[PDB]
Structure 1
């Protein structure tokens, strides 16, 4: 649970930390989903969105 103004406080390397973490989460979720060990499907959507936000912020900071 994050938002853009919340993230814009974070510097780059912190963003990459959260980025890699979220990708690990997405991976573990896909395995759980196959296995059937998952119920809250929507976390996939949420994580996918957060990754998009993070790349977006990086590109803002690279075109600013």
Structure 2
């Protein structure tokens, strides 16, 4: 539910809010992984690339 089309539909403020949410989620995932209580360790990569997508869409909007 984080496809580039959806991200581009979202607004700049909404994109930054989803950006911060994904950063909080990545922080939580890192902490669970370090404590040994993250079953789906691919969540880290999924959230990292979701952050990458949010940056990419924001920078695309900044450029034009």
Mark yes or no: TM-score above 0.5: yes
Deviation track 1:27-50 (CA, whole Å, cap 9, x = no partner) reads 011110111111100000000000
TM-score of the superposed pair, with normalisation by structure 2:
0.94
Deviation track 1:1-24 (CA, whole Å, cap 9, x = no partner) reads 211111111110000110000000
- Counterpart CA distance in 2 for 1:46 and 1:38 is 13
- Counterpart CA distance in 2 for 1:37 and 1:21 is 20
- Counterpart CA distance in 1 for 2:31 and 2:8 is 31
Aligned residues: 64
- Unpaired runs of 5+ in structure 2? none
Greater relative contact order (CA < 8 Å, ≥ 6 in sequence): 2
- Unpaired runs of 5+ in structure 1? none
Secondary structure, counterpart of 1:8 in structure 2: helix
TM-score of the superposed pair, with normalisation by structure 1:
0.94
